[PDB]
Amino acid sequence: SELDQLRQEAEQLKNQIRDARKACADATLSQITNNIDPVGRIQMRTRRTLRGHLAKIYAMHWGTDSRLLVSASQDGKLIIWDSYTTNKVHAIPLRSSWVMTCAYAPSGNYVACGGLDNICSIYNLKTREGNVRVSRELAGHTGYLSCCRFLDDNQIVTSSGDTTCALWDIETGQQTTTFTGHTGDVMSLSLAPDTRLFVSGACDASAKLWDVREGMCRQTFTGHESDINAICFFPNGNAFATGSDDATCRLFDLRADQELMTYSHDNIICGITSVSFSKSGRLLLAGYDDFNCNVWDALKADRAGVLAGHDNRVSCLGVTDDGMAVATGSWDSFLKIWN
Amino acid sequence: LSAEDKAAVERSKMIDRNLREDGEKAAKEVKLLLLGAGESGKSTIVKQMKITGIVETHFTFKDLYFKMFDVGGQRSERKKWIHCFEGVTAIIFCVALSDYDLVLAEDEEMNRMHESMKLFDSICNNKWFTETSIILFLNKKDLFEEKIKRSPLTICYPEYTGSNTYEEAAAYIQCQFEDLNRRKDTKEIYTHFTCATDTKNVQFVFDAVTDVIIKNNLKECGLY
């Protein structure tokens, strides 16, 4: 009855942690922020429509110059757009068209993508030859690639349906650190601003904070009732929201190790596919299966605005590093730039 | 205005034309999703249509270029990736007829044939596949003839009251699978009794695909 004694001991440890969290919940952020003024009329307009994809868009990523962005679609194309002019800078043909994620290196020298091929492909954007070339195919995951984010030109973190995350050395192509402990498909990850930590969201309805260099889970955050599809760090690195199938966004503070706020409306019942913060953190933007993007007041939980410009699922979105614009990508094959 | 952006705008149009021309090829593609429990006969069909996640194969027949995707090894929740295959022309669902009498494993909940029905129920009724034609390859008919001589169908279907002839058992099994379709008026199942030696099955999928194209063209041309 060793398995019996352990299964009961885990319940006591869970109860201890629950009690410790309750002990420091002397108030809620909502009552703390009652005094501050609401943001009011958020009237965002479409300034650009990026046309040229011929299938559903599943991912995009802004470059660090806040001008270039990459998009990935099931038409087998990775397109880099100049968002100021709408010019297509590159059109990269993918060996496998079943992509689910893409990423832009902070240096701008590389893009990444992957999906149901279980491979994260690295693409060199700055070749002497003049075209884009696959520089590395990172193989070793046993489920689909759901997300990836560069740490730098030589390191990238991936998430996979195999329930693990991995840190890769791009030069050698080897998994140098693995991140195990999730019990369901990992759908999304978000890098801390200092790149020392990242958080992951999984189909076990939990989020986990991982220490990159030590390779283990520091904290585990529960509260969601269904799939976590999306996750994003607060700009100061001390919190992160979690888009979920439960039509909710539950901001979790790291240092207080618990939920601070939920963002939901009684008339919103669809899943959330993507989340991102504005530059100051005041606005939480989230993309919904109901074809809309909702803009939440992150401090007061009131909805501030709506972006309704797509004819199909919003599958991805992102805010520029300078905060000047948000891009939304959609199953309807278009991207739109808003500010 | 547009000093050196003129060559950039020109480059954007030159690669925007190649996107259009690459989508014209893809628009002629027949996309096939191969499904089925392990050992149902999927790899035999793959060999028949011929000479790391999504294994892919392509072939030409009667001037139609087919592209078939075998989900294969994909250890994950289907609900998170199945929507990627919205828009495939047809699903080919392979069912092992001879699996009906397979003994339960050590901790197996149900027998192999009923697991196939559960997969078929989930796929046929999936919200992403409402308007997708399902082609059913009932394979290993040769082995079925040997097994049915000595092993009664009641092992698989306790409610079955017919005889253990091929004709009665095959018709009943086909009916049991086709009855799972809750959207018969909007979705059509194309059932074939293929085997390891059958060669008209590739012709069968071509005929079934041609009907699907008619439905798509009638929908596009406004007649549907």
Epitope: R67, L68, D82, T85, N87, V89, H90, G108, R128, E129, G130, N131 | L1, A3, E4, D5, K6, A7, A8, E10, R11, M14
Partner: single-chain antibody, 235 residues
Framework: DVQLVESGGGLVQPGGSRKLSCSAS????????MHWVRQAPEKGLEWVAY????????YYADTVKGRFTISRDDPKNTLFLQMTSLRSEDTAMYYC??????????????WGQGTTLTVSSGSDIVMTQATSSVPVTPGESVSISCRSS???????????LYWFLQRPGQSPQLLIY???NLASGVPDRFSGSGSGTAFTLTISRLEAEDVGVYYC?????????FGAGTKLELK
């Protein structure tokens, strides 16, 4: 390994015709806007013709329009210049130059080896390098200057000024594109600055191999025009 190898040069009588070729290897030739630039024996660089990737756009210099025809054969990775009514003033070394144009690209980043042609016996932007030569010693710091008759700063924010270096006996090499950007493979001891009309290329701790002729060039509008060049002599 990027290669551009010109051929077809030689001695020709005035009024005759001659076809130059440029053979490309080691890169994606098709997606590169080619450029013919020529250099008279004891003179500077002069832009001759441009054909874009896809051949959709062709520009000629005034002194050659009507007489010269530029073309490319993409399947065989070859560039052509069909010349007719050749005059004595056409005697020059002809360089084939590749140039790809997109956001953040580096145009004019590779020049061919050159082929020698010998012929027997206004609105254009003027580029000015008032200093024709400069004596230098290793380790010292130099500043070469260039000026334009029109502002090179565009409403998009870019200033379309390029710096090239021609070492003795070799083809010109890109150093700076759009006034401040360091070309790939160029040591960080070069730097460029300026504003609108006046521009400066600065070298820190100049070495031995740095000696040569430095040309500025505007890419604001066609025809592209070069400065007369500034030579760096050893003391």
């Amino acid at each position: 390994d990027v290669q551009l190898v010109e051929s077809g040069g030689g001695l020709v009588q005035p009024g005759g015709s001659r076809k130059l070729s440029c053979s490309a290897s080691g890169f994606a030739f098709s997606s590169f806007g080619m450029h013919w630039v020529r250099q008279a024996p004891e003179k500077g660089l002069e832009w001759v013709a441009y054909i874009s990737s896809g051949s959709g756009t062709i520009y000629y210099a005034d002194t050659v329009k009507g007489r010269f025809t530029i073309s490319r054969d993409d399947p065989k990775n070859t560039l052509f210049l069909q010349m007719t009514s050749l005059r004595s003033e056409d005697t020059a070394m002809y360089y084939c130059v590749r140039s790809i144009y997109y956001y953040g690209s580096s145009p004019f980043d590779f020049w061919g080896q050159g082929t020698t042609l010998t012929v027997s016996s206004g609105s254009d932007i003027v580029m000015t390098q008032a200093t024709s030569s400069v004596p230098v010693t290793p380790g010292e710091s130099v500043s070469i200057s260039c000026r334009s008759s029109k502002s090179l700063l565009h409403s998009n924010g870019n200033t379309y000024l390029y710096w090239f270096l021609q070492r003795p006996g070799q083809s010109p090499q890109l150093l700076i594109y759009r006034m401040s950007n360091l070309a790939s493979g160029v040591p960080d001891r070069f730097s460029g600055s300026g504003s609108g009309t006046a521009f400066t290329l600065t070298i820190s701790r100049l070495e031995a191999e740095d000696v040569g002729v430095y040309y500025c060039m505007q890419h604001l509008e066609y025809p592209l025009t070069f400065g007369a060049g500034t030579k760096l002599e050893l003391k």
